[PDB]
């Protein structure tokens, strides 16, 4: 039987990978960060409250100018906010109201959204007609589209619930690259700062690091006991943090190919919806199902602070590119800006 | 105050957007959101045609009441990752064919379509997001179940069934088996209706169940529920 021999070879390769990870570990992150000063208590106050959504907010994305937001709620509305003045720049009605994710282009010219319609819709913000119109609808995913991230004005990587990540060309609307290898539904997506690699967390309790231009999984990261819902690179792009339903956040290294630290507390039993890093990467902000966001010392696994003030589950998180503020979206149809 | 002309005009645009969002929300609040569920293509299609690729939107109006019926078929994914999107639906319309009690699911060995429907109903009814959501259970294809129960007894599906091979007693037993999966009888109620291939009163039954749900929502809004 060749299948039994190949299963044995796969088990041997997994054992070799585990042994390499174990022998490559000498001193944990906690053991070397215990000699550095803690961040103390991080106190953040709600500076702005963005009202206007009438259903649960499922996703957000900050602009690269650190002032413009896009939010997605089950109203079927993509609202673009001026976070400084709490002004609604745009209100984009969606054909399908079952939106799970929204992205904002780095140039600021486009927004994306998607969800249970299995379609990533690109919207042109800066048109000559003065309205926001659908640039195109990206079809080809057979499951719900759970995350999308713009690479540039013409490239976008979409996470989906068909256990598949996809890279798209927005001029042609075609499937440029398909990323396969996940067993469970891919729920999260994060692009590297150089936008050469990206990580995706799925429902198989596994995180995979992909190469955009090669279309293959380079490394696979395990350690979670439940479905990974959130993922985010470290600001230098050498590490990333995941958030899952087991009330634990893990930090993984790309170069060490191993988990570095777990961010869990005994009083936390609910799942984690969103994971974001501060500008320096010292603070790890995680949104939970128990209605508040917990700030974590990313180097010491210490609860630096709590962002409480949402009456429902905090579904989405985002730190501005200048690190000035963090915005929390929640199922109570509200967005809050914290400093 | 301390705003420029362009700032004031942007604020006015934001206020126009706020108003338009408010009429959109008021229009959406009067619509009835229905989640259509069932094991495979059993009775969803005939129900949809009687009322009127990811999620399918079905719109129909009955007695000046607009209905939004969502079909989550062909969404072969983990339900728990997207079933919370329908937490605020008015009711769940569950379609179960009555004639697939002896059929095999053809996906697993020794797998029964009726038991698959029963486990799907158990997962949906006892879901954490549908604790207070009423279920309009439809037992479809009662004519085929009429004409095929004589040839094939129901005991091949339920070994504990000891009743006679009559349509009324077996249909009552089937409805009792489906309603026994409700572990939250103190906070939700299950509406069971038997539909033929061409049944006209299904829309009226849905309207009555939705009206009961709307009465309950009105009472909890006024503090009586």
């Amino acid at each position, epitope marked *: 039987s060749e299948l039994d021999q190949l299963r044995q070879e796969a088990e041997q390769l997994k054992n070799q990978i585990r042994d390499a990870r174990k022998a490559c570990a000498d001193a944990t992150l906690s053991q070397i960060t215990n000699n550095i000063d803690p961040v103390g208590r991080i106190q953040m106050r709600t500076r702005r409250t963005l009202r206007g959504h009438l259903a649960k907010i499922y996703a957000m994305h900050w602009g690269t100018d650190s*002032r*413009l937001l896009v939010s997605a709620s089950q109203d079927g509305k993509l609202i673009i906010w*001026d976070s400084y*003045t709490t*002004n609604k*720049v*745009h209100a984009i009605p969606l054909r399908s109201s079952w939106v799970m994710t929204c992205a904002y282009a780095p140039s*600021g010219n486009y927004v994306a959204c998607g969800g249970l319609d299995n379609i990533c819709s690109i919207y042109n913000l*800066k048109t*000559r*007609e*003065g*309205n926001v119109r659908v640039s195109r609808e990206l079809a080809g995913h057979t499951g719900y589209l759970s995350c999308c991230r713009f690479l540039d004005d013409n490239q976008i990587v979409t996470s989906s619930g068909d256990t598949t990540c996809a890279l798209w060309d927005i001029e042609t609307g075609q499937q440029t690259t398909t990323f396969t290898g996940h067993t469970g539904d891919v729920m999260s997506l994060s692009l590297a700062p150089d936008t050469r690699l990206f990580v995706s967390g799925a429902c198989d309790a596994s995180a995979k690091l992909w190469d955009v231009r090669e279309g293959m999984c380079r490394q696979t990261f395990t350690g979670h006991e439940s479905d990974i819902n959130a993922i985010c690179f470290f600001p230098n792009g050498n590490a990333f943090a995941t958030g899952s339903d087991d009330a634990t956040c893990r930090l993984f290294d790309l170069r060490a190919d191993q988990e570095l630290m777990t961010y869990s507390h005994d009083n936390i039993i609910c799942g984690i919806t969103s994971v974001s890093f501060s500008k320096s990467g010292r603070l790890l902000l995680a949104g939970y199902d128990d209605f508040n966001c917990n700030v974590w010392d990313a180097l010491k696994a210490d609860r630096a602070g709590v962002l409480a003030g949402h009456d429902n589950r905090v579904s989405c998180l985002g730190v501005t590119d200048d690190g000035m503020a963090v915005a929390t979206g929640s199922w109570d149809s509200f967005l809050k800006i914290w400093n | 105050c*301390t705003l*420029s*002309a*362009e*700032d*004031k*005009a*942007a604020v*006015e*645009r934001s206020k*126009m957007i706020d108003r338009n969002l408010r009429e959109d929300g008021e229009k959406a609040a009067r619509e009835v959101k229905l989640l259509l569920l069932g094991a495979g293509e059993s009775g969803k299609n005939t129900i949809v045609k009687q009322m009127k690729t990811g999620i399918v939107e079905t719109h129909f109006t009955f007695k000046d009441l607009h209905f939004k019926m969502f079909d989550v078929g062909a969404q072969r994914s983990e339900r728990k990752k997207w079933i919370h999107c329908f937490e605020g639906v008015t009711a769940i319309i569950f379609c179960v064919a009555l004639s697939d009690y002896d059929l095999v699911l053809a996906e697993d060995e020794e797998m029964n379509r009726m038991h698959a429907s029963m486990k799907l109903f158990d997962s949906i009814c006892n879901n954490k997001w549908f604790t207070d959501t009423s279920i309009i259970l439809f037992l479809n294809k009662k004519d085929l179940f009429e004409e095929k129960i004589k040839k094939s007894p129901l005991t091949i599906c339920y070994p504990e069934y000891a009743g006679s091979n009559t349509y009324e007693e077996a249909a009552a037993y089937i409805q009792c088996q489906f309603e026994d999966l409700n572990k939250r009888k103190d906070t939700k109620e299950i509406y069971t209706h038997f539909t033929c291939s061409t049944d006209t009163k299904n829309v009226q039954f849905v309207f009555d169940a939705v009206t009961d749900v709307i009465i309950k929502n009105n009472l909890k809004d006024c503090g009586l529920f």
Partner: single-chain antibody, 234 residues
Framework: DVQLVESGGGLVQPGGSRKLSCSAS????????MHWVRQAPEKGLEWVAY????????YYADTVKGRFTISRDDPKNTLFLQMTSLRSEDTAMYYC??????????????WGQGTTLTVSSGSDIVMTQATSSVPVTPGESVSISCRSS???????????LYWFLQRPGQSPQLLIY???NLASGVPDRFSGSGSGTAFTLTISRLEAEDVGVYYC?????????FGAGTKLEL
């Protein structure tokens, strides 16, 4: 394409009443605030009236206030300028101007072709251009300077300075909308700069396509005031 077509102009006896229409096509007319800007035969842009989106805000110039009426009908995409008691100083070519206002928007971006109407026989921000007509060699850089009585820099960091180029026999177009921001469809050889009350507009590698009259307009507060107009010759 975006198009604004004006109508209703003509020869008018003094004290008469005429109504101007501005048919809009190719853009979402309802979401745009709309301006009327007239230009007398002495070649000077002058703002007349403004109506916001939804008709909630209406402003008039002090010389037409209570005497002109601006209105819009969004179902048929038409902008109206109901004028009564027309006097000889109202003899101008009236431009219907398209402007939208949000964060990062580009108001005054599209101007209509203009309709010509002929009449027979203190606290405002003064916008100043020192040079009214200067000759320029093609292929060489030129600078057009503008000054304002009040500082156009606001507390929010925006300097509300607009640069318009009006080629001979053509409607004005927007080049720079907030003192530095290049407009859409205009070449990168146009650059704007300045601070406070002093402003400049640099055109490196000038071509014959840039020949015209250059206007500086403020949008800090109503009424919107233009410069006298710097004309480039040769």
């Amino acid at each position: 394409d975006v198009q604004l077509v004006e109508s209703g102009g003509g020869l008018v006896q003094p004290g008469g009443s005429r109504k101007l229409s501005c048919s809009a096509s190719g853009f979402a007319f309802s979401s745009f605030g709309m301006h009327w800007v007239r230009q007398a035969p002495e070649k000077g842009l002058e703002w007349v009236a403004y109506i916001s989106s939804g008709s909630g805000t209406i402003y008039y110039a002090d010389t037409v206030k209570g005497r002109f009426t601006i209105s819009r009908d969004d179902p048929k995409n038409t902008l109206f300028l109901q004028m009564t008691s027309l006097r000889s100083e109202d003899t101008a070519m009236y431009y219907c101007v398209r402007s939208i206002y949000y964060y990062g928007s580009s108001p005054f971006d599209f101007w209509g072709q203009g309709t010509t109407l002929t009449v027979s026989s203190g606290s405002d921000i003064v916008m100043t251009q020192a040079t009214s007509s200067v000759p320029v060699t093609p292929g060489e850089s030129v600078s057009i300077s503008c000054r304002s009585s009040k500082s156009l820099l606001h507390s929010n960091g925006n300097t509300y300075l607009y640069w318009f180029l009006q080629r001979p026999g053509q409607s004005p177009q927007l080049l720079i909308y907030r003192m530095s921001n290049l407009a859409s469809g205009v070449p990168d050889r146009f650059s704007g700069s300045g601070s406070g009350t002093a402003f400049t507009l640099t055109i490196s590698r000038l071509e014959a396509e840039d020949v015209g009259v250059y206007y500086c307009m403020q949008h800090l507060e109503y009424p919107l005031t233009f410069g006298a107009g710097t004309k480039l010759e040769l």
